Amino acid sequence: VNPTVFFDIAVDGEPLGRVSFELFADKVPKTAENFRALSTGEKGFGYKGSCFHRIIPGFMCQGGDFTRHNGTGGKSIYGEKFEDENFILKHTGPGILSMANAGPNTNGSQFFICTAKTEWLDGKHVVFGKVKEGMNIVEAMERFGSRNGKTSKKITIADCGQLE
Template sequence: SKSLLSSLLAVGNIASLGTELPSAKPPTRKQISMVIPTMFFDITADDEPLDHVSFELFADKVPKTTENVRALSTEEKGFGYKGSSFHGIIPGFMCQGGDFTRHNGTGGRSIYREKFEDESFLLKHTGPGILSMANAEPNTNGSQFCICTAKTEWLDGKHVVFGKVKEGMNIVEAMKCLGSWNGKTSKKITISNCGQLLISFDFHLNGVYYCCYSKTVQPFLYSS
């Protein structure tokens, strides 16, 4: 019933994803996690909370790149984005972060120990909310990334697009206002916490399968 659906979606400050299924049998949680990994960043400005930004990873298109970002967000390898800052923000262009080793745009590392190759340029920088890797030259991807605040087609073929903002674009807009033409920020913009959104429960209703997410900093692991 509609009342049941409303009650379920109200639990735990969750977001839902409804997908029409070709059959009555819903996909497993493991299958969903592999198709649409959804991450979150909690953002602060001079240690004052702004809120969180969630983003989907295009794991089906660029699996190696998205696994790097996913694992750095969960910090399951013992290092990652938590505590790092957005060192460069240019209004009308992008917010750049991910340097958790030097915090100034000259560092960072991937989960693969070395820099890794540009996986694919199939996906394009189509507008605000697109996430792509930041690198100094071809095939030198590490951990740095940017969140676009405009269409940036001149980056196509040079930087690998790996995701898009799902919720919290208003927070990205607030971050943009703290940037400048040379990238320096008027406040320190920090990822105070980060992780992967897990499916806390799921259900099948009227031919539609719903998976509902809750925040966690733990890796996305299911046995089923």
């Protein structure tokens, strides 16, 4: 019933590990379909070969800008941006997958994986999934980031797709 997608992560081309995500399509369906479809690449464009452009140790890893590769772009499968579906789920801990945005109703394709409890984000970013397998791969990724987000090595989504 709820889809599961994976990401094979790479640090400058060396394979690092697989993170897999359960998308809560039963509560945030339109948000979950957009991450699912961008992971499969079935609509022609997507995450494969994009990188995490902003990694802040102890906060979150952000990625998903496949058009401009630096947080200023990305687009959804419904057009460039769409509404905040709802705020049922909250940022309760590491592994929560939440939507990045540029204020309300500006969701595109950027997402962030929390590596800590970030309750201040509640009510401001739609949560739509959580890490299933691979959280120590997300944790190891932190080491390649910095206080301001700049990463030291290129961290890419080498491959991604749907598992179930």
